[PDB]
Amino acid sequence: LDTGSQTFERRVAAKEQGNPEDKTPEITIGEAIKKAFSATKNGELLYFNGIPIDESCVELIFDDNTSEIIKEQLKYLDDKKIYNVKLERGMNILIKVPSYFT
Amino acid sequence: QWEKKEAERVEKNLDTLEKEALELYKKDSEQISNYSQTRQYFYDYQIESNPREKEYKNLRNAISKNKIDKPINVYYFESPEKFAFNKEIRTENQNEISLEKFNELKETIQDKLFKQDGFKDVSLYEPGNGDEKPTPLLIHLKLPKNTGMLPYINSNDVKTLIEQDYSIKIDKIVRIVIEGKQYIKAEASIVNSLDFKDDVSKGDLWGKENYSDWSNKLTPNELADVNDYMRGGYTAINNYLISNGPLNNPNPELDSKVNNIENALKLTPIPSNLIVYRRSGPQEFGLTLTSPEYDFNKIENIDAFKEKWEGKVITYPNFISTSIGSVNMSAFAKRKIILRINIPKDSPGAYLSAIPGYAGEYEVLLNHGSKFKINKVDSYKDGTVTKLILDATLIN
Amino acid sequence: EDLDTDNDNIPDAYEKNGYTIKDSIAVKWNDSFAEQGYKKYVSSYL
Amino acid sequence: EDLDTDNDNIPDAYEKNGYTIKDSIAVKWNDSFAEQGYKKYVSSYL
Amino acid sequence: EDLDTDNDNIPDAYEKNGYTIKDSIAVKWNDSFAEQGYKKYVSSYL
Numbered sequence: 271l272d273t274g275s276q277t278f279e280r281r282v283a284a285k286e287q288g289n290p291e292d293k294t295p296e297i298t299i300g301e302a303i304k305k306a307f308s309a310t311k312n313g314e315l316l317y318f319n320g321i322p323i324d325e326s327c328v329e330l331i332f333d334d335n336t337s338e339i340i341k342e343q344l345k346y347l348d349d350k351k352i353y354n355v356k357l358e359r360g361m362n363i364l365i366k367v368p369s370y371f372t
Numbered sequence: 373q374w375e376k377k378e379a380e381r382v383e384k385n386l387d388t389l390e391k392e393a394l395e396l397y398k399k400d401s402e403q404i405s406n407y408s409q410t411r412q413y414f415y416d417y418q419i420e421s422n423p424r425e426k427e428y429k430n431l432r433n434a435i436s437k438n439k440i441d442k443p444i445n446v447y448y449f450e451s452p453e454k455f456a457f458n459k460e461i462r463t464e465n466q467n468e469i470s471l472e473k474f475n476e477l478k479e480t481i482q483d484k485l486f487k488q489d490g491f492k493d494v495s496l497y498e499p500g501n502g503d504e505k506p507t508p509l510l511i512h513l514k515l516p517k518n519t520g521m522l523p524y525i526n527s528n529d530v531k532t533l534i535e536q537d538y539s540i541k542i543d544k545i546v547r548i549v550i551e552g553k554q555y556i557k558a559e560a561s562i563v564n565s566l567d568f569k570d571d572v573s574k575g576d577l578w579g580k581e582n583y584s585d586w587s588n589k590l591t592p593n594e595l596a597d598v599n600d601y602m603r604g605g606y607t608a609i610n611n612y613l614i615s616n617g618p619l620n621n622p623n624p625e626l627d628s629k630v631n632n633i634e635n636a637l638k639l640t641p642i643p644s645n646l647i648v649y650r651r652s653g654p655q656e657f658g659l660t661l662t663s664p665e666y667d668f669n670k671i672e673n674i675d676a677f678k679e680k681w682e683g684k685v686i687t688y689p690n691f692i693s694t695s696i697g698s699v700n701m702s703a704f705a706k707r708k709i710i711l712r713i714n715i716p717k718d719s720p721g722a723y724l725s726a727i728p729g730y731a732g733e734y735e736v737l738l739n740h741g742s743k744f745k746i747n748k749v750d751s752y753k754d755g756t757v758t759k760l761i762l763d764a765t766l767i768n
Numbered sequence: 769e770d771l772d773t774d775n776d777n778i779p780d781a782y783e784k785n786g787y788t789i790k791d792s793i794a795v796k797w798n799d800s801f802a803e804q805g806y807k808k809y810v811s812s813y814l
Numbered sequence: 815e816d817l818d819t820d821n822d823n824i825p826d827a828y829e830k831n832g833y834t835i836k837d838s839i840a841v842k843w844n845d846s847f848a849e850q851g852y853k854k855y856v857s858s859y860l
Numbered sequence: 861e862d863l864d865t866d867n868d869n870i871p872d873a874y875e876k877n878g879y880t881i882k883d884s885i886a887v888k889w890n891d892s893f894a895e896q897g898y899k900k901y902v903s904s905y906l
């Protein structure tokens with residue numbers, strides 16, 4: 271997470287794909303972001319220290335592999351929001367907080 | 373390396389006799405531990421003139437030289453037989469533990485108290501790779517403050533040698549998986565109690581310290597029936613109570629007798645938890661000296677007595693005159709069963725031998741009709757005879 | 769029926785269904801005590 | 815029976831005829847769970 | 861047997877209501893001996 275003045279790096283555990291004996295609980299990108307940054311959730315808004323880090327209020331940057339995985343997975347579900355993808359062990363998500371917002 | 377150097381440090385700043393004891397322990401811990409378990413049940417001269425005695429003392433006096441300042445968690449393996457589980461949980465080659473055997477071990481160690489004794493080697497961590505895992509049962513205990521724990525080195529590892537003088541209460545057991553094998557992990561607690569195993573000097577000292585002011589607050593009739601109970605009438609009172617009096621033969625004066633001797637015990641209860649002893653004969657367990665079952669050198673006899681009495685609740689209708697000394701006396705040297713009762717706090721009873729003039733030495737009396745639950749039955753060898761010790765407890 | 773495969777003081781069902789910590793012992797997650805401030809944890813029971 | 819010569823908590827018959835691991839425990843291989851994702855292992859029992 | 865959760869020789873009730881040390885043993889705080897020089901301590905029982 272890159273606020274503009276300081277950054278915060280986090281590692282969040284994810285389940286291995288081809289493994290039946292991997293019992294790591296499976297969470298979404300929104301839940302992972304809420305857990306990794308201690309964000310507060312009022313109703314539908316996710317807040318860092320004083321900054322809204324909602325999916326619409328920031329810029330999500332990925333690498334080619336993560337962008338691919340997210341693109342393919344968005345096609346198979348309603349409510350096509352990136353904060354509902356399943357965080358498959360190798361994503362490289364970068365939230366960027368915009369300098370000017372309305 | 374810190375604990376290594378600390379253990380090697382403690383093992384130099386101690387007596388040379390203690391070094392000799394501990395070094396003998398490093399190889400022959402088997403018979404040393406058996407002796408520390410079964411030493412208290414011999415004669416006085418038998419205990420003192422025994423060769424393995426003194427070094428025990430020495431190593432014992434080493435343990436008490438290193439007390440801990442806060443409760444410490446320790447782990448050690450234990451055989452299920454130590455907790456009156458007379459069958460196998462799982463073969464040492466098997467990997468899984470059945471639900472049935474688990475539930476059985478649960479229901480057989482639910483709310484019992486198992487008194488411990490002797491030396492024990494423990495560790496401060498859960499056993500992992502390379503550690504010796506002999507039994508499928510792992511005990512995780514919490515030793516309290518001021519508990520002697522001597523660290524030592526068996527030339528390759530570090531162990532903690534302690535001496536256990538308490539009773540264990542298993543609370544919860546769980547299935548664990550270590551390195552591909554299933555084990556049972558049990559949580560235990562310490563239930564301390566007063567004990568004077570062989571040094572009956574401390575015993576009767578505390579006894580006449582606490583119950584010297586006992587008899588001087590009694591009515592002359594109750595003191596009279598107490599002292600003619602002491603001086604021979606006890607046999608008649610016992611065979612009157614076990615003769616089914618209050619339902620078959622109502623005897624008014626003997627009922628007054630027994631109610632006055634019973635009320636003469638509920639005036640100043642036992643102030644703490646006591647470990648009391650009593651040798652007894654076969655006539656109380658439906659047996660006699662001429663029966664073949666009394667020959668406890670038979671494995672089948674020990675097994676049948678266990679199956680018939682272990683885990684049961686005996687009920688004694690008469691008064692149970694008992695002793696606070698594990699040492700063998702000549703007045704009852706022929707008896708082979710040793711009942712080891714645990715008496716809780718605020719219990720009815722009294723140490724009647726505080727007033728001199730009694731044949732029974734260091735003798736305590738408690739109310740008649742109080743049941744005893746037998747938690748464990750084990751055995752030892754006095755010379756050539758095999759005598760049984762019965763870890764029991766007062767169940768009110 | 770209680771069961772701790774990985775031996776980390778949290779039962780299997782609690783790890784795979786949700787738990788929290790109260791007085792240093794893991795307790796099963798009731799949805800009630802979310803307003804007291806407690807959080808719901810999930811983990812690998814293996 | 816179950817016998818472990820090399821003392822690695824996998825029985826001899828499993829190592830020589832096939833096994834897998836389920837909940838940290840070795841189990842004899844049944845082909846039915848080849849499609850659930852489990853792999854078949856063989857190793858030296860000595 | 862009084863309850864000591866954190867295993868630091870001070871019971872829970874004493875830590876959360878007030879205690880003081882006398883002869884190297886924690887005793888429940890009585891306001892009677894505040895003028896004898898003793899102090900009232902509180903701490904976390906966890």
Ligand SMILES: [Ca+2]
Pocket residue numbers: 771772773774775776777778779780783813
């Ligand atoms: Ca667990």
Ligand SMILES: [Ca+2]
Pocket residue numbers: 817818819820821822823824825826829859
């Ligand atoms: Ca093998």
Ligand SMILES: [Ca+2]
Pocket residue numbers: 864865866867868869870871872875904905906
């Ligand atoms: Ca405390």
